[PDB]
């Protein structure tokens, strides 16, 4: 294991993915055997040898530890940094690619946890997959909404309303300024609301509201489904509806699924908002499973228009990996846990969605933060506003538009973020009676 | 509490939840394209205003998200009363037409910002 | 021999065919709500009041069948003055709008009621 | 037959669909080996014995018979109650179900007679099945119709006219507050007017009286049918309209197509009307054949918006056998003839339709009796109306109101229904013409 796999002279080339590993060794593994044992079984090792190794050359095949660096303050902890060669992968394969190299060695006994931290996806590899059905700047220009963050709602209660109560709400929320209302990732196809339902009662409201507003409006139609078969029937009424927006649980689809909705919707011109639900799972413990950063660059390779990215009540670390969703270029910054150089030569960028527990204080935070390319997404936010869903909505609108113009006139967010929403409520009731209720 | 209106509430996008803008107002909106390096432009429609559907129904087609360009993006502009000046012609040539600035981002290739700076009376 | 109307003969499902309800009448139906623990909510419209086609053609899909909430649902409502005092501070800011009582059922989990309360002249 | 299939000590399974038959045996026979002939013949019961029964386990699948009383007053009548392992059945096929409870059992030779009067159909077979395509609730959202029964005419002569004269009527009908119009039964495609024509009429009408009205209209299109493909083109027609509402003779075009429709209409958003041309051949005779309660368990299951529930003009069987159309839960009730506790987990309910020689006079009997979530269907009570089929539609709209607006004010329709209609009179014409030519 250690003389074939650890090759520390290796000169990394162009088309190579890279992982960056956190590897915990056993107690008395020096890191060496860790770094090789981790390039090993995420490739060819075998444990007996085997006459067929002759008939090829495995080293064309090999993964390679080329580099251990120690993890500060931690004992026994080591960022092992691995090169496969481009020739493991299926082109367009997101499914391959994590196969490959997560599918076997977070297992392997020498090791007593594992973190996948990062991955240098080469251009080559990028190019072959298709990326967000339009991205950033396509959704901007279709939607019509320059020069501030979107804004969008999660109905509530997930289950419970029939469709066309849920539909009410729906039309309360994007008729006071909402661009977006939402299913939550847990509504799909259930008893008190079937999923045709839901969509047939969500397309009458957003056309009453853009009618009412002349603004377009989306609301993110949810279909994820138990079969390829059943999600299909989902976004193809909506493509039937004419309605701009559908969503997926990626991780919970999986990958497959995933990628077919991606193809799907560029065929037929639909954004696709992805939600991260069951990330947690994988993404929370600094010791074992993946970072999110990871799940992010394979969601921008199958594709997505919008990925939820978290709330920001280390901000570092969820700014580095924004800029991964965004950008076309991002510089190693170990600083912000970018451990790799990365380009996407032109791969369309991924708008981030913020949510969780936010309201109308935290407006002058986020707009400082993402900037205009994301997607604020209140939930309790808006449908706790004391007026009712269309007050929640302008409270919400309100404050966001108060804050970019503050903040275009050269006003500083992170210092006069209270102020400008206090000189706000001076002329907005709605936004006043929305500052008393929270903080 | 309050009953939000239904009736002669159409928006236009970023800023249209505000107050009108003042001259004031409307100079620093123009100062930060400026300080960006982005293009001024100005935009009239006299027709609708709105979004609607006349000519197609598929996913993200929609009407009146085009409206017309005032002369052309003032490049090299380096001063906001320029763009205000053209706001004024505008006006007078077409004070009937809903007027908005935009802006475009040559490093980027897209348009970036886009918003209302003139309606007519009972708007 | 009576042949029945065609022209501004527009109706509002449940209760529309009677005479238009009197103060006292709409005070007992409001009862009827609040004795079976409904929750009485008001809706309104100023634009088309009937239903229509517009957005989409397909089974089951009509426009115009939301109406907008006046306020809220008046959860914990023990008095019916209280829904005629909310339904006459409605036709004080919209005269020329409909106004309908709608009850919520929590229990079925439903919209279960709805009925005209006021029209405009001319309907 | 006696020692394996008659177990008075068996308790019941939540899986086990139970039987309630009511048992004629022959002179003779003793109950004991009437109720176990039932449970055998029902199951894996064998004249002779064959040596294939010891490749399986026989009693993992046999029917017991598990309980037998008396029937009061009428002379060597038993109810027997059969279990039946859920193993038995196809998940989702009523066929399946019916064929292997009924198909055998019926001409055994030591019974004179056998009615099948219930089932408890258990909740893990009951989630197998699609249920109602919409259901009450949804089919109220959709059309926008609350707080009263809904209101619908057959078009009559059912043959004869042209498919012009047949949608002029409808117009006509509809223009006066009903909410549908129907085909008859029997109305399919004939010589003198062919389905097609029928449908394009009933569309040009439906849609002159919405528009004049204002008011959601229906008409049921019978798409009946020879065959799936013809029943298929007929559905898919109405779909292409636009049209809410089809209809089905269940019980002539068969559990098999019935299914078929049920899921399409699911897929393309139609209510379905069920009608039960042909019941009375099976469920008239008390000790011979099957209660329509079964029949209508099993249109829940198969799916249908709305079911045939017959005239009240015994009524607490009618109200029993209601209940289980429209409610999650019903308890065991041998008043209501509801031999089993029956859950539906959250199947969504079916509308009950009364028709046949009712009038005016009957709906504050029909408001009171069926409530809210019902279908008044008036054929003659609309055309024979003197002064023709509008003014017909008001009367009927009217005596309905008024018995709303009386019963929400506290009044008692048992008591004063004839002093409510009485009332209504004094302002409707239509209505005052109406009651001078009925009662
Ligand atoms: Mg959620
Ligand atoms: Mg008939």
């Not at chain 1, 969509?199 to 138990?226: D, M, P, R, S, V």
Request: with cysteine; glycine share 8%; proline share 5%.
């Amino acid at each position: 294991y250690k003389l074939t796999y650890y090759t520390p002279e290796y000169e990394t080339l162009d088309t190579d993915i890279l992982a960056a590993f956190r590897v915990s060794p056993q107690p008395g593994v020096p890191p060496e055997e860790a770094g090789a044992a981790v390039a090993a079984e995420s490739s060819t090792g075998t444990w007996t040898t085997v006459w067929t190794d002759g008939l090829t050359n495995l080293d064309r095949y090999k993964g390679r530890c080329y580099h251990i660096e120690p993890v500060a303050g931690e004992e026994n902890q080591y960022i092992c940094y691995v090169a496969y060669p481009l020739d493991l992968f299926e082109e367009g394969s997101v499914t391959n690619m994590f196969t490959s190299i997560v599918g076997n060695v977070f297992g392997f006994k020498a090791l007593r946890a594992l973190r996948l931290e990062d991955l240098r996806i080469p251009v080559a590899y990028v190019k072959t997959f298709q990326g967000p059905p339009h991205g950033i700047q396509v959704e901007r220009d279709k939607l019509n909404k320059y020069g501030r963050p979107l804004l969008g709602c999660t109905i509530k209660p997930k289950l419970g309303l029939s469709a066309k109560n849920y539909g009410r709400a729906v039309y309360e929320c994007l008729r006071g300024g909402l661009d977006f209302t939402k299913d939550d990732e847990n509504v799909n196809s259930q008893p008190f609301m079937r999923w045709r339902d839901r969509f047939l009662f969500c397309a009458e409201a957003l056309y009453k509201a853009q009618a009412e507003t002349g603004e377009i409006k989306g609301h993110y139609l949810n279909a994820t489904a138990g079969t390829c078969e059943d999600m299909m029937k989902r976004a193809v009424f909506a493509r039937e509806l004419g309605v701009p927006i559908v969503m997926h649980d990626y991780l919970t689809g999986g990958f497959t699924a995933n990628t077919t909705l991606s193809h799907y919707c560029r065929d037929n011109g639909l954004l696709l908002h992805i939600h991260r639900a069951m990330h947690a799972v994988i993404d929370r413990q600094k010791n074992h499973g993946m970072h999110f950063r990871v799940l992010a660059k394979a969601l921008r390779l199958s594709g997505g228009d919008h990925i939820h990215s978290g709330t920001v009540v280390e901000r570092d670390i969820t700014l580095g990996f924004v800029d991964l969703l965004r950008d076309d270029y991002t510089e190693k910054d170990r600083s912000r846990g970018i451990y790799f150089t990365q380009s996407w030569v032109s791969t369309p960028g991924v708008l981030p969605v913020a949510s969780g527990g936010i309201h109308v204080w935290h407006m002058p935070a986020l707009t400082e933060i993402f900037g205009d390319d994301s997607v604020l997404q209140f939930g309790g936010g808006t449908l706790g506003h004391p007026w009712g869903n269309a007050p929640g909505a302008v409270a919400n609108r309100v404050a966001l538009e108060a804050c970019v113009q503050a903040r275009n006139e050269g006003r500083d967010l992170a210092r006069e973020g209270n102020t400008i929403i206090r000189e706000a409520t001076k002329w907005s009731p709605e936004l006043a009676a929305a500052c008393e209720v929270w903080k | 509490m309050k009953v939000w209106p239904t009736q002669n509430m159409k928006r236009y996008e970023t800023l249209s939840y505000l107050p009108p803008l003042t001259t004031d107002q409307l100079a620093r909106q123009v100062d930060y394209l400026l300080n960006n390096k982005w293009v001024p432009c100005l935009e009239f429609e006299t027709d609708h205003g709105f979004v609607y559907r006349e000519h197609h129904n598929s996913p993200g087609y929609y009407d009146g998200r085009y409206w017309t360009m005032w002369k052309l993006p003032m490049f090299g502009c380096t001063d906001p009363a320029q763009v205000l000046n053209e706001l004024e012609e505008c006006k007078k040539e077409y004070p009937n037409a809903f007027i908005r600035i935009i802006g475009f981002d040559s490093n980027r290739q897209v348009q970036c910002v886009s918003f209302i700076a003139y309606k007519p009376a009972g708007y």
